[PDB]
Every structure is written in structure tokens, then in C-alpha cells.
Amino acid sequence: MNKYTIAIDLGYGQIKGINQDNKRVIFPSIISSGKDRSLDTFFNSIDNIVDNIHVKILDEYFNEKEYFVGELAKRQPSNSSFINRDNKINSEENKVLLATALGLLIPNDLPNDTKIHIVTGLPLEHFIKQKQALNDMLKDFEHTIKFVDHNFSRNIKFEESNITLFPQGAGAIFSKINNDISSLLIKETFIGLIDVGFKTTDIVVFRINKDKEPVFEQEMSATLDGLGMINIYNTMDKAFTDNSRDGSKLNTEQLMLLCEEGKIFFKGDYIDLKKDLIKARKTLSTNIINKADGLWGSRKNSFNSIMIAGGGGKVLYNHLKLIEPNMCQLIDNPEFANAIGYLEFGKQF
Amino acid sequence: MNKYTIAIDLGYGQIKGINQDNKRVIFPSIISSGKDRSLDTFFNSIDNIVDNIHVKILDEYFNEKEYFVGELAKRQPSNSSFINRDNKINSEENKVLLATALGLLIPNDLPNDTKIHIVTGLPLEHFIKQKQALNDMLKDFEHTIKFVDHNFSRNIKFEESNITLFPQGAGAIFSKINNDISSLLIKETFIGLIDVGFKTTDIVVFRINKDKEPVFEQEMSATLDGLGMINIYNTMDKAFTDNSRDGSKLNTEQLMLLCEEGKIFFKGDYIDLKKDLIKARKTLSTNIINKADGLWGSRKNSFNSIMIAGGGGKVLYNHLKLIEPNMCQLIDNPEFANAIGYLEFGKQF
Numbered sequence: 001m002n003k004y005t006i007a008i009d010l011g012y013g014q015i016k017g018i019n020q021d022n023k024r025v026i027f028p029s030i031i032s033s034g035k036d037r038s039l040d041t042f043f044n045s046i047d048n049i050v051d052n053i054h055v056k057i058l059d060e061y062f063n064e065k066e067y068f069v070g071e072l073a074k075r076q077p078s079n080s081s082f083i084n085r086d087n088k089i090n091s092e093e094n095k096v097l098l099a100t101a102l103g104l105l106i107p108n109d110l111p112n113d114t115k116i117h118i119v120t121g122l123p124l125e126h127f128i129k130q131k132q133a134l135n136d137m138l139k140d141f142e143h144t145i146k147f148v149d150h151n152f153s154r155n156i157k158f159e160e161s162n163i164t165l166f167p168q169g170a171g172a173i174f175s176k177i178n179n180d181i182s183s184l185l186i187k188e189t190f191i192g193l194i195d196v197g198f199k200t201t202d203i204v205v206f207r208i209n210k211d212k213e214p215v216f217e218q219e220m221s222a223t224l225d226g227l228g229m230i231n232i233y234n235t236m237d238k239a240f241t242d243n244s245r246d247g248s249k250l251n252t253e254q255l256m257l258l259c260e261e262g263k264i265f266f267k268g269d270y271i272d273l274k275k276d277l278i279k280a281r282k283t284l285s286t287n288i289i290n291k292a293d294g295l296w297g298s299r300k301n302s303f304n305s306i307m308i309a310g311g312g313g314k315v316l317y318n319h320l321k322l323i324e325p326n327m328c329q330l331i332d333n334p335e336f337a338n339a340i341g342y343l344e345f346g347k348q349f
Numbered sequence: 350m351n352k353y354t355i356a357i358d359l360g361y362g363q364i365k366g367i368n369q370d371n372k373r374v375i376f377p378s379i380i381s382s383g384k385d386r387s388l389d390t391f392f393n394s395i396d397n398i399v400d401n402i403h404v405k406i407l408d409e410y411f412n413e414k415e416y417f418v419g420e421l422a423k424r425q426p427s428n429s430s431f432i433n434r435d436n437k438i439n440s441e442e443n444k445v446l447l448a449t450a451l452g453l454l455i456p457n458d459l460p461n462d463t464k465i466h467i468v469t470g471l472p473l474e475h476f477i478k479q480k481q482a483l484n485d486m487l488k489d490f491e492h493t494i495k496f497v498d499h500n501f502s503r504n505i506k507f508e509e510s511n512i513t514l515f516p517q518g519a520g521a522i523f524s525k526i527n528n529d530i531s532s533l534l535i536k537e538t539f540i541g542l543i544d545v546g547f548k549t550t551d552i553v554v555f556r557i558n559k560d561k562e563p564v565f566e567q568e569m570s571a572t573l574d575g576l577g578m579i580n581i582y583n584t585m586d587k588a589f590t591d592n593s594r595d596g597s598k599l600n601t602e603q604l605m606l607l608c609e610e611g612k613i614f615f616k617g618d619y620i621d622l623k624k625d626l627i628k629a630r631k632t633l634s635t636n637i638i639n640k641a642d643g644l645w646g647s648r649k650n651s652f653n654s655i656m657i658a659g660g661g662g663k664v665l666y667n668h669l670k671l672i673e674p675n676m677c678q679l680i681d682n683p684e685f686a687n688a689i690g691y692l693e694f695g696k697q698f
């Protein structure tokens with residue numbers, strides 16, 4: 001019969017997912033060793049399962065391990081360190097996160113003969129170099145998940161011809177605007193997508209041909225490795241210790257709490273770093289202006305709409321506007337641009 | 350056995366070619382340093398190889414270099430500058446372009462003992478002065494081409510008695526109309542071909558003798574050096590910067606896009622120069638009227654059919670009509686007049 005569709009993202013910041021039925025999940029990419037949650041169940045009921053993902057994951061040898069994963073793992077003091085996390089796409093940390101995003105997006109009582117076409121992503125520079133790693137790992141993927149405290153398990157095993165690879169930010173403007181940008185694309189124009197990710201910033205462009213079809217410009221588009229939201233969290237971590245003059249250091253929860261607001265509540269008091277937050281965000285925005293113009297010479301004039309996406313684009317939209325003011329806009333769902341783009345352009349097959 | 354036939358043109362605007370089997374190619378005369386195309390292969394398939402000519406060219410020392418050549422090189426921002434391109438016929442830029450036109454016109458699985466008679470051209474004033482340059486260079490020509498992304502290679506090496514030189518615009522009306530103009534040539538008449546090329550405009554005539562055979566009039570025919578389509582692109586480039594009043598300047602892609610339409614899409618807006626386009630095309634047409642009458646005194650009355658050809662003749666046919674209205678016509682394939690003329694009049698041998 002027909003095979004199901006689930007679009008997932010493998011972003012180091014936060015795993016983003018959506019299914020065929022437009023139910024979507026989002027949670028930070030943090031795991032920890034799960035332990036038995038029974039006492040805290042009595043105090044506060046788990047209304048939202050996304051907040052409290054305790055999970056059990058089997059394998060082919062049925063060697064289960066518990067995992068605090070996602071939002072609950074951020075509350076744990078022994079979690080994955082997440083600021084020097086492994087960059088390997090075949091890591092067990094990526095294995096658990098991939099299982100969890102599949103766990104929340106398979107609805108109840110699907111037919112077991114009906115499989116799932118899953119659509120994933122790689123960074124745009126790494127889509128050729130690191131292709132066969134995730135291509136073989138998803139072939140190697142054979143587990144069975146178990147949700148503690150909610151008592152529903154899912155079987156997770158994929159053959160070939162179910163998995164599907166598209167680059168990061170590719171289908172976000174290849175599809176998802178293809179019905180809408182027909183009035184906006186004209187001829188010999190350029191559209192631009194700037195995904196401000198956590199570790200790596202994506203810059204991807206497309207040329208509109210004479211036949212009013214998009215086509216890709218690999219010499220006008222690249223992935224900025226080492227430039228992204230992580231440079232803010234790495235800088236403001238140093239800015240806190242220098243403001244402390246004690247050697248005290250925020251943990252992984254306090255640090256990710258910091259650069260959403262800039263005002264951590266530290267030792268009965270707010271330690272204010274609001275000046276260094278606005279300063280470092282312009283510092284990141286400057287290193288996306290000047291790197292866009294490295295790929296874009298006088299070609300910058302020929303654009304018609306620079307879209308931006310990613311989680312970081314939402315918090316930088318005013319500062320990042322000055323690449324091309326009053327032309328550039330914001331995509332509709334800044335996190336789920338890669339998700340919906342993998343969904344619709346994954347529905348081609 | 351029988352030796353194959355390929356007719357090529359060496360026009361600075363766009364290389365025009367045709368084979369013995371009437372398969373013909375056309376691409377602009379732009380090269381650039383080729384790089385590895387693998388990521389863009391995944392996005393959009395190369396259906397037409399003429400659009401996406403990535404190529405590898407060996408030599409006698411097997412020193413290969415990659416080349417983005419033709420339409421793809423126009424999309425590159427580091428290409429051959431093409432507005433001050435070298436006029437040398439023995440340049441490496443001419444070497445690569447000559448190899449590429451031979452690459453697309455040798456069909457699959459020809460016998461290696463069967464060679465190819467290639468027919469080229471020189472400008473009509475330069476056919477005597479610059480004869481031995483291309484005559485020796487094609488003797489010096491020894492390479493082996495490799496098409497990336499399509500995986501077919503061709504061996505390219507020519508001895509003497511395969512190469513063949515005819516002037517530009519010569520065989521276009523010497524042959525290619527010789528079967529058809531029998532009803533139109535009478536006696537002591539003049540036929541005229543005006544090739545509006547990119548850099549140089551060709552004016553070539555023929556006298557019909559008493560024996561109803563064509564014969565050449567070198568004092569009634571010359572090549573207009575410095576007059577041609579390039580004077581439009583050089584003028585409208587100045588017209589854009591003067592309309593901008595910013596110092597901004599179009600690149601090689603935007604400039605060649607301009608004077609096919611006159612309306613470049615510049616910084617979210619159309620910068621209109623439609624008035625200066627119609628004005629400069631009459632300015633070029635005036636400098637072909639007055640230069641034709643420099644060679645043609647009261648001899649102008651004795652014509653019977655002024656043909657025009659070249660790429661520029663197609664876009665100037667209405668303005669250039671006023672040399673001799675309602676006598677003058679347009680050749681059938683305005684680009685391939687030199688190509689088919691080199692083909693049939695190259696089939697004499």
C-alpha cells in the first residue's frame with residue numbers, strides 16, 4: 001500500500017520534525033542517561049510529552065538503554081555536553097535523537113505493511129562528502145522505541161528506497177514557495193535563503209532561467225562552517241566569567257537560558273549582560289554580511305527576495321536586514337523551513 | 350576511407366558549428382576555469398549538454414585543465430572578460446573554444462582511420478594577412494578532449510590536407526544559394542552579403558559574369574573593423590552608469606542580457622534604457638549605410654538582392670533595410686550562414 005511520510009531535521013541546535021499529517025515536533029538536541037521517573041509523576045502530570053521525553057530504545061540484540069532526551073535532558077546536570085558535541089552523523093547521540101523524532105511522529109495504529117518514507121538532510125557542503133554515511137546508517141537503522149510513562153512503542157527499521165536525502169535549505173525555497181513565488185520570479189533573477197543555524201550558517205541561492213524554472217548555483221552558495229548561533233553562546237560564556245571575576249561558570253541550562261534574554265538570575269541577583277548580547281549579535285550579523293558578499297560580487301544587485309530562515313534568523317532579522325534592506329523578508333515558520341521543505345519536496349516521490 | 354566533415358566558425362561573439370550530418374551547435378565564446386560539478390548535478394539534471402559544458406582538455410604532454418566554457422562560463426563571475434578579449438587566433442582561449450566545437454560535433458563511434466575535414470574561417474581582410482597563423486596552429490593542434498558528467502572523450506589531432514580555409518561570408522552566398530539564385534542572377538549584376546558580426550561587420554559582394562558565374566570584387570568589398578554589435582554593448586554600458594549616477598556597473602552576464610531586451614532588473618527594480626537601445630541601433634545602422642556607400646558609388650543601383658546575415662542582422666533587419674528597401678532580404682539561418690556556407694562549399698573537396 002501507500003508508504004507514510006515523515007520529514008526530520010538533524011540540526012545540532014534542536015531537532016525539527018514534521019509528518020505527512022502536519023503534526024510537528026521540536027526539542028533541543030540533548031540526551032542524557034534516563035532513570036526511573038515515578039515520584040515526579042505523582043507531583044505534576046506529564047501533559048505535554050515533548051517536555052518530558054523519557055524513553056527506552058531497543059536494538060537488534062534487544063539491549064535497551066533508558067534515555068532522558070530533549071527538554072528533560074536539559075534539566076539534567078549530567079547530560080550531553082552539547083557545546084563540544086560530536087560532529088559525526090553516525091554517532092549514538094544522533095542515533096537516539098533520530099529515534100525520538102521518529103517516535104513522536106508515527107501516529108497510532110498505522111498498518112505495518114505501510115512503511116514510511118523519511119526525508120532527512122545534510123549540510124550543503126557536506127551533502128556530497130558525507131552522503132554515504134547517513135545513507136548506510138539509515139540502512140543500518142533497526143531499533144524499537146519505548147515511551148516510558150505513556151506506554152506506546154513503535155517499531156523503527158528502514159530498508160532502502162524509503163530513505164531520501166536532500167541538502168539543508170534546498171527544498172525550503174525549491175518547494176514551499178514554488179506555488180507562491182510564481183508572481184515574484186521573473187527571469188535571470190536570484191532568490192536567496194540564509195539559514196542561521198546553530199553551528200553552521202547556510203547560504204543557498206537559485207537562478208531563475210529563461211523557462212522560469214529554478215536552477216542551482218554552487219559557486220554562488222556555500223555553508224559557513226564555524227559561523228552561526230554557537231558563536232554567541234561561546235562568547236557570552238566568556239563574557240559571564242569576565243563579569244563574574246570569580247571563576248564561576250554557567251552550566252548548559254543557564255547558558256542556553258542566557259542568550260534568549262541576556263539576564264541570568266545568578267546568586268540571588270540578576271547578572272546583566274544585555275550590552276554584550278546586542279554587541280555580539282551585530283558581530284555575528286557582520287560575519288554574515290561580509291561572507292555573503294564573498295560569494296556575491298555585483299551579483300547582489302540581481303536579487304529579488306532574500307529569504308532568511310533557521311532559529312537564529314528569527315532573533316537576528318532586524319540586524320541581518322542590512323544585507324539588502326526592504327527587499328529581504330522572513331520565512332513563515334523560521335524553524336520548520338527545512339522541515340516543510342523536506343515534506344513537500346519529499347512528496348514528489 | 351572517406352573523411353568526415355565539420356564546419357566551425359571562430360566568431361568572437363558566439364562559436365557556430367555544424368557537421369556533415371547537419372547537427373549544429375551554438376554557444377557564446379566565453380571560457381572560465383572549470384571546477385568540480387557534483388552538488389549541482391543532484392539538483393537539476395544536465396538535459397542539454399550545450400548549456401552546461403564542463404570539459405577537460407589534454408595535450409601532447411597530457412597536462413589537462415578543466416574549463417567552464419560557453420553558456421556555463423557566462424554564469425561564472427571569474428570568466429574571460431570578453432569585451433577586451435585577445436584578438437590573436439592562436440590564443441589558448443581560441444584553442445579551448447576550437448576543441449569544444451569539435452567535441453560536440455564528432456558523433457559516437459566514428460572509425461578512427463576516417464579523419465575529419467574541418468572548414469574554418471578568417472575575416473575577409475585578414476584571410477591573406479593572418480592565413481599562416483591558423484594554417485600552422487591547426488597543424489600544431491593535438492589534444493584529447495574529455496566531457497565531464499557525460500563520460501565521452503574525443504581524440505582531436507589534424508594533419509595537413511584535412512584543414513581548409515575560406516573567408517568569412519564567402520561560401521554563404523557562393524554556395525548555399527548557388528542552386529537557388531539561378532533564377533535571380535542574370536548578367537552583370539551584383540549580389541551583396543552584409544554579415545553584422547560582433548566585433549567586425551563583413552561586406553562582401555560578387556559579380557555575375559557573362560557566363561552567369563559569380564566572381565569576386567575585392568575593391569567593392571571589405572570588412573568593417575571596429576563596427577559591429579560590440580559598439581552597442583560598449584555604448585549601453587556607458588548608458589547604464591550614466592543613468593545610475595552611482596558608479597555601479599553591470600557584469601558580463603547583465604550586459605549581454607541588456608541589449609537583447611533593454612530592461613535589466615537592477616536592485617529590486619527595472620532600470621529602463623529602452624530609448625537608448627533603439628537610438629544606438631540606428632546609430633550602428635547608420636554606420637553600415639554610410640560605409641556600404643563608401644565602397645559602392647553608383648554601383649549600388651546594379652544590385653539585385655542584398656542579403657544580410659550574422660546574429661546582428663536578425664536584430665537590425667528593419668533598421669538595416671534602408672540601404673536598399675524592398676530589394677534586400679534576410680538569409681534563412683542568420684547565425685549559421687557562415688556555418689552552412691563552410692559546409693557545402695567545403696563539400697567541394
Ligand SMILES: Nc1ncnc2c1ncn2[C@@H]1O[C@H](COP(=O)(O)OP(=O)(O)O)[C@@H](O)[C@H]1O
Binds near residue numbers: 011015260309310335
Ligand atoms: N526564541 C529564541 N531566542 C533565542 N534564540 C533562539 C530562539 N529560538 C531559536 N533560537 C536559536 O536558534 C537555534 C536553532 O536553530 P535551528 O533552526 O534549529 O538550526 P539547526 O538546524 O542548526 O539546529 C538555537 O540554538 C537557538 O540559539
Ligand SMILES: Nc1ncnc2c1ncn2[C@@H]1O[C@H](COP(=O)(O)OP(=O)(O)O)[C@@H](O)[C@H]1O
Binds near residue numbers: 364
Ligand atoms: N536574439 C538576439 N538578441 C540580441 N542580440 C543577438 C541575438 N542573437 C544574436 N545577437 C547578437 O549577435 C551577435 C552574434 O553574432 P555572430 O553571427 O555570432 O557573429 P560573429 O561571427 O562575429 O560572432 C551576438 O554578440 C549578439 O549580440
Ligand SMILES: [Mg+2]
Binds near residue numbers: 195310
Ligand atoms: Mg538548520
Ligand SMILES: [Mg+2]
Binds near residue numbers: 544547
Ligand atoms: Mg561572423
